[PDB]
Amino acid sequence: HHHHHVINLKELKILHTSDWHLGVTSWTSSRPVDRREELKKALDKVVEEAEKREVDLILLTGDLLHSRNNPSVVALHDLLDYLKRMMRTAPVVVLPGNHDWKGLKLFGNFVTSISSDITFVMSFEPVDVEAKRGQKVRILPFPYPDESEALRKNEGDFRFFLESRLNKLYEEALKKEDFAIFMGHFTVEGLAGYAGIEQGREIIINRALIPSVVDYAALGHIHSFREIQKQPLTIYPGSLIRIDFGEEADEKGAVFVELKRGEPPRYERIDASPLPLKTLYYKKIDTSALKSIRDFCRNFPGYVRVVYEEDSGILPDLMGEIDNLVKIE
Amino acid sequence: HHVINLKELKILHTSDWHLGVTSWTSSRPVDRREELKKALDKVVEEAEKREVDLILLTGDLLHSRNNPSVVALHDLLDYLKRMMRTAPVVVLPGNHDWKGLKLFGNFVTSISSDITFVMSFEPVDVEAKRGQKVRILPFPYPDESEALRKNEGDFRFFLESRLNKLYEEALKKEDFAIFMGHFTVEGLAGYAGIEQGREIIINRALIPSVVDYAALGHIHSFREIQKQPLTIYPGSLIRIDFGEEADEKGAVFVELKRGEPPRYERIDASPLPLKTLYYKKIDTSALKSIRDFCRNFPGYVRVVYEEDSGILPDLMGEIDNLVKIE
Ligand SMILES: COc1ccc(/C=C2\SC(=S)NC2=O)cc1OC
Ligand SMILES: COc1ccc(/C=C2\SC(=S)NC2=O)cc1OC
Ligand SMILES: [Mg+2]
Ligand SMILES: [Mg+2]
């Protein structure tokens, strides 16, 4: 079973999902929670929506595995499992994150060569792919620089390097046939309300430098859904689960994008319905704070953190009592 | 294609590539890649020339059981692709350490109809280049079910029960049934055994007699183990270390025809030769013998000597293909 060929098809339906973080166990220093069941439920939801909408093309934009090092066998099994499920629905294009595995490019090249339903982009070189109904899509990829990031002493030369790669992708996008799609794995400059992860070693790109002649710019690396701009339509889908506290207010899920020649692109979010997070803050863990903690957590379907400033003696076994209390600090 | 041409099957069977090996790293490292790729290219071109229907790979394709080098893994995936372009490929891996191998194997088998990884005792039905249906009966190294070895008696009974199961499954054949095994046949004539650390030994009579061909890997020399059923180790493609001076190295082309005995030809690798030179003492007459031998010898030379002979003249630094003195 391969791709249809529709004459004069000027429409393209896209599923764009990202930042799965397969394999993550959260709060290992306090109360480890294996996020696999929740994450697989969200991925199943995304797969089912993609099949229901009959998307033509599936875009994955990196950090699909939580560990930059060797992932667990179960994490790799899940990643490959869902790749197969997505390939069964529509051709898949994969822009991986900044993983350490030196064989990743080799694996990506190999599976790209042996299947017309998956493409790994791991360089700045454009790739022409065919979507489910025969649409020709020029992929303009922008991965984390291959330690050209570390191989640079100069901030000015590195920024010029990145801009020159963006300019080249712009030129290639002009040589488009039907559709052009930018795929990037980086941090957009000046993101409203981004922790920055106390920033060090990120790739920061000005959103105005993303080639404006692409039909859609699919970004990954950021855990919250963000519509970055409308021309070109530029989106981070977000992660599928709330990975840690700080992500209480994020929107989580994937995005369905519809492109039509001569018309503006339209999209819908596919919400993941993630479990919620809550941080409870107290001056002191007194009896009034204890009943607040116990009563809140008992009716809260997600995970709870408790923060308190002042010493309050030996606390009772709160976590033994409360199954969804994962951290006290 | 579909013919079905269900009476004949042309097989290329090669094994034990040891991609990534550098030899004599403690004395004079020799990167074997250029010689090995030359042999692999020869095998590929022969497979294309004979228009084989099926390509069988039986393990130890990588030298390191640990994480292989990028260049070695690149070479492996490169030749897999070249072979897939010629005919469908069935891969029975050796005992590699990578815990992700089974996942990789499952994934690539699922996304391509031109390659199949067999990594358990489960039989797999595959289709050859001209539509022939081939039941693969695989026998890899026990999945550290070998480490699950309390008693030699219980372990051999486990191994024999798997062989019995493959025998029964081979009876459910349609066109051809092919055994693929990665192990050491018992009592191999002139096999060093590496003091048999962690080897799996199988009596050749226990290989299911109802298969049309039994493709074995793990042994570095070509061996016709028996004729019924035809059972072959192709050998490695290069002489990996001294001890393999007299081996035949290459691959094998096998032709099966139902109701006919199987036939095969060796595809010789033309490997570079190895030679060990022995002297009682390294005198000036022995040095000129060594120097003159190596000057006309197209392969790699080892010098062994019993008697103390003082500090050696620059024997190896002088001679580029003298790789070991011990
Ligand atoms: C065969 O093994 C692998 C297959 C795919 C990936 C993908 C990745 S990793 C990341 S971060 N973003 C991605 O899309 C990683 C693999 O090995 C760590
Ligand atoms: C994706 O990476 C790999 C792909 C194939 C193999 C095959 C092997 S290894 C062996 S021994 N015999 C074989 O056929 C090993 C890999 O990773 C070490
Ligand atoms: Mg990353
Ligand atoms: Mg082995």
Side-chain angles (χ1 to χ4, degrees), chain B residues 111-193 195-197 199-299:
Chain B
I111 69 174
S112 168
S113 56
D114 285 308
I115 190 161
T116 302
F117 273 73
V118 287
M119 292 178 69
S120 71
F121 296 101
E122 303 163 314
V124 186
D125 293 304
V126 307
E127 189 173 72
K129 190 172 175 47
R130 288 181 289 171
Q132 308 93 322
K133 286 81 185 69
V134 183
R135 171 146 277 213
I136 299 290
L137 297 318
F139 197 101
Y141 251 60
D143 264 74
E144 263 317 24
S145 217
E146 30 155 342
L148 292 17
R149 208 242 185 158
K150 287 102 154 50
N151 13 333
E152 160 84 323
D154 262 61
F155 188 47
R156 284 178 72 81
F157 185 83
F158 169 81
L159 299 173
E160 191 183 336
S161 74
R162 301 286 73 78
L163 287 168
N164 294 337
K165 181 52 178 177
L166 298 178
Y167 180 92
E168 294 290 293
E169 293 291 338
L171 293 182
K172 298 205 283 117
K173 193 213 310 182
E174 190 176 356
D175 317 334
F176 301 100
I178 296 181
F179 182 91
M180 300 174 69
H182 190 84
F183 51 77
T184 303
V185 164
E186 181 170 17
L188 258 188
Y191 177 54
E195 222 75 24
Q196 194 158 0
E199 297 293 297
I200 299 301
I201 289 158
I202 306 294
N203 193 314
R204 62 197 80 192
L206 303 186
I207 296 172
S209 59
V210 293
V211 302
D212 300 283
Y213 180 62
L216 307 186
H218 183 50
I219 296 310
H220 297 184
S221 51
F222 166 81
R223 295 296 192 94
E224 180 195 290
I225 295 302
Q226 58 193 354
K227 289 185 186 187
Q228 287 185 324
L230 181 60
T231 303
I232 289 169
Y233 292 100
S236 62
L237 296 177
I238 64 169
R239 307 187 184 283
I240 294 173
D241 200 351
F242 300 94
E244 303 180 27
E245 289 96 334
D247 293 9
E248 292 185 283
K249 307 298 202 184
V252 303
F253 167 85
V254 184
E255 194 151 13
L256 307 179
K257 183 171 171 54
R258 292 202 55 185
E260 298 274 348
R263 297 185 293 101
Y264 76 95
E265 302 177 48
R266 290 197 59 251
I267 302 170
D268 195 82
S270 306
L272 296 180
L274 302 178
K275 181 71 172 187
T276 310
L277 297 175
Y278 295 110
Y279 303 88
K280 67 167 188 75
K281 201 167 172 65
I282 302 292
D283 52 324
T284 26
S285 288
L287 152 58
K288 197 205 173 66
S289 166
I290 291 168
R291 176 70 185 104
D292 289 333
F293 185 95
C294 296
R295 209 181 289 110
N296 293 280
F297 188 70

Side-chain angles (χ1 to χ4, degrees), chain A residues 62-65 71 76 79 94-99 101 104 107 120:
Chain A
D63 283 335
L64 306 185
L65 294 164
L76 181 56
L79 170 64
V94 180
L95 180 85
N98 183 35
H99 203 271
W101 184 31
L104 183 52
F107 168 90
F120 274 74

Side-chain angles (χ1 to χ4, degrees), chain A residues 12-196 198 200 202-279:
Chain A
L12 184 70
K13 289 176 287 174
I14 295 166
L15 170 70
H16 171 204
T17 174
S18 172
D19 294 83
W20 300 351
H21 283 254
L22 281 166
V24 59
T25 293
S26 303
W27 315 300
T28 53
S29 71
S30 55
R31 185 214 280 270
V33 174
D34 188 341
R35 312 302 298 279
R36 183 187 184 213
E37 174 178 347
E38 180 192 357
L39 175 57
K40 282 172 54 59
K41 180 179 174 177
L43 284 159
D44 294 344
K45 185 174 182 176
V46 176
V47 170
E48 186 173 47
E49 263 300 293
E51 306 167 328
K52 182 181 176 175
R53 313 212 196 202
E54 300 180 317
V55 299
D56 299 307
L57 195 60
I58 293 168
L59 309 173
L60 313 181
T61 46
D63 283 335
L64 306 185
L65 294 164
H66 185 68
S67 172
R68 66 164 44 252
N69 319 109
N70 186 38
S72 69
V73 169
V74 62
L76 181 56
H77 166 267
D78 290 343
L79 170 64
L80 295 176
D81 178 9
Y82 282 97
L83 286 187
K84 277 160 35 179
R85 300 188 202 191
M86 274 163 187
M87 294 170 68
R88 293 183 193 111
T89 308
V92 171
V93 183
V94 180
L95 180 85
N98 183 35
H99 203 271
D100 287 343
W101 184 31
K102 305 271 286 183
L104 183 52
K105 190 163 176 57
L106 304 174
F107 168 90
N109 168 274
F110 181 73
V111 304
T112 299
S113 310
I114 70 177
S115 168
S116 294
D117 286 306
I118 190 165
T119 301
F120 274 74
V121 285
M122 291 183 271
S123 69
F124 300 98
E125 302 163 313
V127 187
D128 293 305
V129 309
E130 187 175 70
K132 192 172 177 47
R133 288 183 288 168
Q135 308 93 319
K136 280 78 185 68
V137 183
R138 171 144 277 213
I139 301 291
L140 296 315
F142 196 103
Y144 252 59
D146 250 45
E147 218 65 284
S148 294
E149 49 186 342
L151 280 16
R152 120 261 182 287
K153 50 224 153 234
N154 203 331
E155 163 84 323
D157 302 334
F158 188 47
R159 282 165 68 179
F160 183 81
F161 166 80
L162 298 174
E163 190 183 336
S164 73
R165 300 286 72 77
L166 286 166
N167 292 337
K168 181 51 178 293
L169 293 178
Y170 182 97
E171 293 172 286
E172 292 291 339
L174 292 182
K175 299 159 52 185
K176 192 211 309 183
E177 190 171 356
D178 309 335
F179 302 97
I181 296 181
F182 182 88
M183 301 177 71
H185 188 86
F186 50 77
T187 303
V188 165
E189 181 171 18
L191 259 187
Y194 178 53
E198 21 240 18
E202 296 292 295
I203 300 302
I204 288 148
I205 306 293
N206 193 313
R207 64 197 80 192
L209 303 186
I210 296 172
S212 62
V213 293
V214 305
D215 298 288
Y216 178 61
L219 307 187
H221 183 51
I222 291 308
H223 298 182
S224 52
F225 166 84
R226 298 296 192 94
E227 182 197 290
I228 297 302
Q229 56 191 353
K230 287 186 259 292
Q231 281 192 321
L233 179 61
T234 306
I235 287 170
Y236 290 100
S239 61
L240 294 179
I241 63 169
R242 307 191 182 283
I243 294 172
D244 202 351
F245 301 90
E247 301 179 26
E248 291 97 335
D250 292 9
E251 292 186 284
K252 307 300 202 186
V255 303
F256 166 84
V257 185
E258 193 150 13
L259 309 180
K260 300 185 200 66
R261 274 195 40 189
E263 301 280 348
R266 75 166 195 85
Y267 75 94
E268 302 177 50
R269 291 196 57 250
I270 301 171
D271 195 81
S273 303
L275 296 176
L277 302 177
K278 181 70 171 188
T279 310

